[PDB]
Paper text:
[name]-[name]-2 uses the receptor-binding domain (RBD) in the S protein to interact with [name] 2 ([name]), which is also the receptor of [name]-[name]. We found that [name] from sperm whales, minke whales, dolphins, sea lions, fur seals and hippopotami could efficiently bind to the RBD of both [name]-[name] and [name]-[name]-2 and facilitate the transduction of [name]-[name] and [name]-[name]-2 pseudoviruses into [name]-expressing cells.
We prepared complexes of MW-[name]/[name]-[name]-2 RBD, MW-[name]/[name]-[name] RBD, SL-[name]/[name]-[name]-2 RBD and SL-[name]/[name]-[name] RBD, and solved their structures at resolutions of 2.87, 2.93, 3.03 and 2.89 Å, respectively. However, the MW-[name]/[name]-[name] RBD and SL-[name]/[name]-[name] RBD complexes showed more divergent architecture with hACE2 complexed with [name]-[name] RBD, with RMSD of 1.598 Å and 2.069 Å, respectively. Notably, MW-[name] showed even higher binding affinity with [name]-[name] RBD than hACE2. Notably, MW-[name] forms significantly more van der Waals (vdw) contacts and comparable H-bonds with [name]-[name] RBD than hACE2, which explains its stronger binding to the [name]-[name] RBD. When bound to the [name]-[name] RBD, R42 (corresponding to Q42 in hACE2), E325 (corresponding to G326 in hACE2) and N329 (corresponding to N330 in hACE2) on MW-[name] form additional H-bonds. When bound to the [name]-[name] RBD, MW-[name] shows five substitutions, including D30Q, Q42R, L79I, M82T and E329V (328 in MW-[name] numbering). V328 (329 in hACE2 numbering) and R392 (393 in hACE2 numbering) are no longer involved in RBD recognition. On the [name]-[name] RBD, S432, T433, D463, D480, T485 and Q492 interact with MW-[name] but not with hACE2, and Y481 exclusively interacts with hACE2. When binding to the [name]-[name] RBD, MW-[name] involves another substitution, E329V, which negates a salt bridge between E329 and R426. Notably, R42 of MW-[name] forms two H-bonds with Y436 and Y484 of the [name]-[name] RBD, and E325 of MW-[name] forms an H-bond with Q492.
Residue numbers in the entry:
A (entry chain B): 321 to 506
B (entry chain A): 19 to 711
The structure:
C-alpha cells in the first residue's frame, strides 16, 4: 500500500513538543515525491542522507515524530543542538539519519486571543537522551527536594506556548515532523 | 543549589510569564489607541493591571535572592532591574494617599482652563491656550493666557505638590536614597562595573559641567532673540535685560521654535520644504515608510519585518474609528514591532517616519537580550537614536538622492543659516530650561529650597540660568513649575537634557565613521554601512551593559560630552557673533516688565524690637494690598468718573522683604497686561499723607 504521509503532515492533531508522538511506517512503498517537490515546508534539513537519493534507497522503517514548536525553536531540532527543546523536550542523536520537516502553521495553531494548547518543558533534572520522552508534570525544585507549589523555588516544569497571529515568525507556531530511517546497517 | 542557581531558575519562570503578560498588556493598549471606545479602555486597563500586579508580586520574590551572592553579571543585572521596589516600601496609608495626590495632580492639569474676557467662553490648554502661546503675537493676549494658566492650574496644584514632595521623599529614603531627586538620578547609576561606575552625584556634576559650556552658545542665541523681540514688542522688553516669560513661543518657554517667524535670519529666502514635491510625485503614507526603510537598509540595519507592514497603522483609518494621532513606535513583544502614525504626505511626517523607525530598529536590535534587559541603555538613549535619524533625513544631500530636490540644487549660506537657527530655537533654547527646571526639583526634593522659597528660587534661577523674567510677580501661592505636564505628572525631566547631549555625540561619531568632510549639520550617514555597524554595537546591548560602556561602544568615551553639540552649531555661533556686534550679549536680573511702574514701600518699625507681643511678619502684609485697591477704586470713580471693582487681586507685590520693604503696583482687573502708571497711583498717595519721598 501507499505510505500514509497525508495522515501525518495533514493530521488535524499535532501533539505538544514534550509529549511528541511517533508513528511507525513500514510495509508500504515509500513515495516521498510530495515532500521535496512541494514548497510547503520551511525546512527540509536532511541528516546523514540526501533528499534526492531518498527515492533510490529503499527497504527501511520510517518513524514520524510529530510536534509543534515555536518559530525560533526549529533551530534546536538539529542533531547536536542545545536549548530547552533539545535538552528537555526532544533530542536528536549526533548520528541521526533522516530529514526534519517544519512548516509555519500560524493560520492553524495561532489565534487572535492566543492559543495556549501547546506546552514545552523548560525545567528538568538532566538532559533527555536521544529519542527519549518525559511526560511527567511533577513540580520542579533546583535542589531536587519535592515540594508543593505555589512556594519559593518550586515551579511547574511545563509552560504553555502563547501563539498569536500577530507575533513575528520566530514566535509563530511551526509543525515539525521528524523522519527517522532504518539504516542499511541494521 | 546555590542562590545564583535558584535566582537563575526564578528568572526563567519570570521571563516566560512576563513575556505573555507584557505582550497581552501591549496588545490591549494597541487596540485602544487604534480604536478608542469605552470597551477598549476596560480591556487596556485590565491587561495593564495584570502585568503591574504580576511585576510587583514578582519583584519582592526577586529580593529574596541577594545580589552579592550572584557571581554572574548577566543574572545580576536582571535581578537588579527586577529588585527595584519604588513605592512598595511605603505603608498602606501612605501609598494610598500618594496615589490620591498623583491622580489629583493629573486631574487638575488635565481639566485646567481659563475664561476669556469674552465671558461666555472657556479656553482649554489644547488647542485654545496653546494657539495663543504658539501663534498669537499680541503682548496683552499672551500675558492673559500665560498668567491665566499659572493662576488657575498652578495655584490649585500648590498644596498637592507640597504634600507630593513629602510623600515622595519618605519613599526614597525608605529605599535608602537621600531624597526623591536622588531616586530619580538612579537611572544613570552604575555600581557593579569597574571603571564604568556612574554615581547619582556624578550625574549632577556632569549636567552642571556640560551646561557651563552651552552657556556661551545660549547667551549669543538669547541676545539675538532678544533683539528680534524688541522689533516685535517695542518698549516692552529691555535691550540689556531678560526675556518676558510669555513671549517665548509657548506656554512654558520650553522651546523657542515658535519664535522662528519673528527671529528668522533671512526671511526672503524660503525653507527647504519638500512636502509639495512629494504631492507631485504621487507619494503616499506607505511610500514614506518604504523610503524610510531603505535609509536603514542602506547603513546595514535590518529591514522591517513583513509582520510590521500588515500590523502597523501607517495612516488614519478610512472607517469612522477614533485613533490617537500621536506618532509612536511600538515594541509589543514576541517579535511584534509596530508604528502608529496618522501619516500625511507632508515633509514633517516624512522626518517623523525616520524618527519612529529609529526606535523600531533599536527595539529589533536588543530583541535577543533577556526580557529584563530589553530596553535602552538609559532613559536618554532611546530618544537619541531616533533623533539622529531625522538629522540625516533632513539633509539636502538625502533629499536630492531621493529625487525630492532637483539635482542642480544650490544650498545657499542663507538657507543653511536659517536651518541652524531653526534647530537652535528647538535644541539649544530648551537646554537651559531643562537644566533649570530639573535643578529646581533636585533642590526642592533635597530640602535645599524651603517651601516658603519655592517661588522665590524658581524665578530667581529663571532670571539667572534661563535669562527669563516673570511678567508678573508670583508670590508663594503659585506653583509655576507644576503648570508643566511633566512636573505635575511625576516624570523625571533630565532625560530631555541628556538625550540632547547624547544625540550629537552619536551623530558626530557616526558622521566620523561615515568619513563626512565638512560641517556637521550637512552630514548624511546614508549608504555608509560602517556607520550602521558602529551603531549596532550600542543598539544590540540594550540594558545588558552599563550605559557608560554602551556609550563608549559608539562614541569612544564613557562620559557625557557637549563639544559635539557645540560643533553642530559652530556655523551658527560664528553668524550670531557677527550679528550681536552692536547688541548687548547677556542679561541683567534687575530689570522686570513691572519694575518701571513699581512703587517701593518703606516700612518704619515703630514698635519695640524683640517683642513677642507683635509678630509683624506675614499676617499683616495682605491688608495693604486690599487697602491700596480702595484708594485707587475711589480715585477712579471720583476723578475718572468710571467705576471699576478694584480688589486685592489687582494690587501686585514684588521683592517682599518682611518687616523691611516691598515693591508694589496695581493693574486694571482682567487687564493685567496694562499696569496703571505710578504717577496716577502716587497722585492717589499724595492725596493722603506722604509716607515715602
Ligand atoms: Zn520618539
Amino acid at each position: 500500500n501507499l505510505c500514509p504521509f497525508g495522515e501525518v503532515f495533514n493530521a488535524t492533531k499535532f501533539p505538544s513538543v514534550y509529549a511528541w508522538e511517533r508513528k511507525k511506517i513500514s510495509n508500504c512503498v515509500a513515495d516521498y515525491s510530495v515532500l521535496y517537490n512541494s514548497t510547503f515546508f520551511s525546512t527540509f534539513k536532511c541528516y546523514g542522507v540526501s533528499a534526492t537519493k531518498l527515492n533510490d534507497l529503499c527497504f527501511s522503517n520510517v518513524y514520524a515524530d510529530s510536534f509543534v514548536v515555536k518559530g525560533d525553536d526549529v533551530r534546536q531540532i538539529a542533531p547536536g543542538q542545545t536549548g530547552v527543546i533539545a535538552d528537555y523536550n526532544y533530542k536528536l542523536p549526533d548520528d541521526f539519519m533522516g530529514c526534519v520537516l517544519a512548516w509555519n502553521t500560524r493560520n492553524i495553531d495561532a489565534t487572535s486571543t492566543g492559543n495556549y494548547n501547546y506546552k514545552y518543558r523548560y525545567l528538568r533534572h538532566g538532559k533527555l537522551r536521544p529519542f527519549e520522552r518525559d511526560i511527567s508534570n511533577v513540580p520542579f525544585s533546583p535542589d531536587g527536594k519535592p515540594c508543593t507549589p505555589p512556594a519559593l523555588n518550586c515551579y511547574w516544569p511545563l509552560n504553555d506556548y502563547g501563539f498569536y497571529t500577530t507575533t513575528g515568525i520566530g514566535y509563530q507556531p511551526y509543525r515539525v515532523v521528524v523522519l527517522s530511517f532504518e539504516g542499511s546497517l541494521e | 543549589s546555590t542562590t545564583e542557581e535558584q535566582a537563575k531558575t526564578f528568572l526563567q519562570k519570570f521571563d516566560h510569564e512576563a513575556e505573555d503578560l507584557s505582550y497581552r498588556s501591549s496588545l490591549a493598549s494597541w487596540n485602544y489607541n487604534t480604536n478608542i471606545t469605552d470597551e477598549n479602555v476596560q480591556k487596556m486597563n485590565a491587561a495593564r493591571a495584570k502585568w503591574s500586579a504580576f511585576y510587583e508580586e514578582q519583584s519582592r520574590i526577586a529580593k529574596t535572592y541577594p545580589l552579592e551572592e550572584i557571581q554572574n553579571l548577566t543574572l545580576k543585572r536582571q535581578l537588579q532591574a527586577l529588585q527595584q521596589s519604588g513605592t512598595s516600601v511605603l505603608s498602606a496609608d501612605k501609598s494610598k494617599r500618594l496615589n490620591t495626590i498623583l491622580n489629583t495632580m493629573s486631574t487638575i492639569y488635565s481639566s485646567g482652563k481659563v475664561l476669556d474676557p469674552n465671558t461666555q467662553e472657556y479656553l482649554v490648554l489644547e488647542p485654545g491656550l496653546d494657539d495663543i502661546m504658539e501663534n498669537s503675537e499680541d503682548y496683552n493676549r499672551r500675558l492673559w493666557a500665560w498668567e491665566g494658566w499659572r493662576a488657575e492650574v498652578g495655584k490649585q496644584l500648590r498644596p498637592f505638590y507640597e504634600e507630593y514632595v513629602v510623600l515622595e521623599n519618605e519613599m526614597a529614603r525608605a529605599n535608602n536614597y537621600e531624597d526623591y531627586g536622588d531616586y530619580w538620578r538612579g537611572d544613570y547609576e552604575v555600581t557593579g562595573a569597574d571603571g564604568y561606575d556612574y554615581s547619582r552625584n556624578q550625574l549632577i556634576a556632569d549636567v552642571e559641567r556640560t551646561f557651563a559650556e552651552i552657556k556661551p552658545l545660549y547667551e549669543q542665541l538669547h541676545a539675538y532673540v532678544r533683539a528680534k523681540l524688541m522689533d516685535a514688542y517695542p518698549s516692552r522688553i529691555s535691550p540689556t535685560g531678560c526675556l518676558p516669560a510669555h513671549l517665548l513661543g509657548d506656554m512654558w518657554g520650553r522651546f523657542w521654535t515658535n519664535l522662528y517667524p519673528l527671529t528668522v535670519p533671512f526671511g526672503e529666502k524660503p525653507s527647504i520644504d519638500v512636502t509639495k514635491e512629494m504631492q507631485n510625485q504621487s507619494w503616499d503614507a506607505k511610500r514614506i515608510f518604504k523610503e524610510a526603510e531603505k535609509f536603514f537598509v542602506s547603513i546595514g540595519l535590518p529591514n522591517m519585518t513583513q509582520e510590521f507592514w500588515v500590523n502597523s497603522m501607517l495612516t488614519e483609518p478610512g472607517d469612522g474609528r477614533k485613533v490617537v494621532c500621536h506618532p509612536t513606535a511600538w515594541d509589543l513583544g514576541k517579535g511584534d514591532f509596530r508604528i502608529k502614525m496618522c501619516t500625511k504626505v507632508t515633509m514633517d511626517d516624512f522626518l517623523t517616519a525616520h524618527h519612529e523607525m529609529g526606535h523600531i530598529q533599536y527595539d529589533m536590535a536588543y530583541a535577543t537580550q533577556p526580557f529584563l534587559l530589553r530596553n535602552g541603555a538609559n532613559e536618554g538613549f532611546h530618544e537619541a537614536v531616533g533623533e539622529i535619524m531625522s538629522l540625516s533625513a533632513a539633509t539636502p544631500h538625502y533629499l536630492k538622492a531621493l529625487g525630492l530636490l532637483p539635482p542642480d540644487f544650490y544650498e545657499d549660506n542663507v538657507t543653511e543659516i536659517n536651518f541652524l537657527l531653526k534647530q537652535a530655537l528647538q535644541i539649544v533654547g530648551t537646554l537651559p530650561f531643562t537644566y533649570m527646571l530639573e535643578k529646581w526639583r533636585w533642590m526642592v526634593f533635597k530640602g535645599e529650597i524651603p517651601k516658603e522659597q519655592w517661588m522665590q528660587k524658581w524665578w530667581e534661577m529663571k532670571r539667572e540660568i534661563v535669562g527669563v523674567v516673570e511678567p508678573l510677580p508670583h508670590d508663594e501661592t503659585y506653583c509655576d513649575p507644576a503648570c508643566l505636564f511633566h512636573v505635575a505628572e511625576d516624570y523625571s525631566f533630565i532625560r530631555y537634557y541628556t538625550r540632547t547631549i547624547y544625540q550629537f555625540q552619536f551623530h558626530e561619531a557616526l558622521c566620523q565613521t561615515a568619513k563626512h568632510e565638512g560641517p556637521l549639520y550637512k552630514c548624511d550617514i546614508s549608504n555608509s554601512t560602517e556607520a550602521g555597524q558602529r551603531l549596532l554595537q550600542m543598539l544590540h546591548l540594550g540594558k545588558s551593559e552599563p550605559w557608560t560602556l554602551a556609550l563608549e561602544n559608539i562614541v569612544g568615551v564613557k562620559t557625557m560630552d557637549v563639544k559635539p553639540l557645540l560643533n553642530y552649531f559652530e556655523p551658527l555661533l560664528t553668524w550670531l557673533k557677527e550679528q550681536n556686534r552692536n547688541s548687548p550679549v547677556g542679561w541683567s536680573t534687575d530689570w522686570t516688565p513691572y519694575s518701571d511702574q513699581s512703587i517701593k514701600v518703606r516700612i518704619s518699625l515703630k514698635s519695640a524690637l524683640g517683642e513677642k507681643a507683635y509678630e509683624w511678619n506675614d499676617n499683616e502684609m495682605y491688608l495693604f494690598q486690599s487697602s491700596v485697591a480702595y484708594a485707587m477704586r475711589e480715585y477712579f470713580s471720583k476723578v475718572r468718573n468710571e467705576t471699576i471693582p478694584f480688589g486685592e487681586k489687582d494690587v501686585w507685590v514684588s521683592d517682599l522683604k518682611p518687616r523691611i520693604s516691598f515693591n508694589f503696583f496695581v493693574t486694571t482687573p482682567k487687564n493685567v497686561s496694562d499696569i496703571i502708571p505710578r504717577t496716577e497711583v502716587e497722585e492717589a498717595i499724595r492725596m493722603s499723607r506722604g509716607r515715602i519721598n
